[PDB]
Amino acid sequence: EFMHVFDNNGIELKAECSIGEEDGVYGLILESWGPGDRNKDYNIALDYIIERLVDSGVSQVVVYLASSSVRKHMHSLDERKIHPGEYFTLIGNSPRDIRLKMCGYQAYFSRTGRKEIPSGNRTKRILINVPGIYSDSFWASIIRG
């Protein structure tokens, strides 16, 4: 029912994902980590996704908060975009440091809206879009390794 991200040696990570169109945006959904060991490889999987996107010649993405709570309470897609600008930049740092910046933006969301001060979980259900990519085969090669 769910696809998974695979590591560099072809081993399945504990990181459920899906490829398709959600709220009019085509890309990769990374499922949330929790409770306990549910999708506990979230951060490792996201580091791999960022590394492979960069290796594939992708420099910028758009990332939306896609939790059931935020989809319900925040109707505006532009408000669900986690980063302030049009795009999030993947180049100019290690995949881990890019990932830390990306996931820091998740801390600005509550169940019902934005916070002024960031706090809490940074391993939420997210939708990652590559502008001009509408094909599952591109995303299949990112999560496969």
Block residue for tokens 């980063």? 83
What is the closest distance, in whole angstroms, from the C-beta atom of residue 57 to DNA in the complex?
26
| Residue whose CB is less far from DNA, 58 or 82 | 82
Say which residues have a Cβ less than 8 Å from residue 59's Cβ, sequence separation at least 6.
Answer: 89, 90, 91
Number of residues this chain uses to bind DNA (CB under 7 A): 29
Query: Site mask, DNA, residues 22-41, x = CB under 7 A?
Result: ---------xxxxxxxx-x-
Tally the residues of the chain. 145
What is the closest distance, in whole angstroms, from the C-beta atom of residue 124 to DNA in the complex?
4
121 interacts with DNA by CB under 7 A: yes
CA dist 140 and 2 (Å) reads 13
Q: What is the DSSP string of 21-49?
A: EETTEEEEEEPPP-STTTTTTHHHHHHHH
Residues from 56 through 75 that contact DNA (CB under 7 A): 65, 67-70
110 interacts with DNA by CB under 7 A: yes
CA dist 81 and 135 (Å) reads 21
Torsion (CA) 2, 75, 84, 64 in degrees, nearest 10: 0
User: Considering only 20-28, 83-91, 104-112, 127-135, which stretch makes contact with DNA by CB under 7 A?
Assistant: 104-112
What is the closest distance, in whole angstroms, from the C-beta atom of residue 91 to DNA in the complex?
18
76 interacts with DNA by CB under 7 A: no
- Of 77, 71, 74, the C-alpha closest to 125 is 71
The binding site for DNA (CB under 7 A) comprises 31-38, 40, 43, 65, 67-70, 100, 103-104, 107, 109-111, 119-125
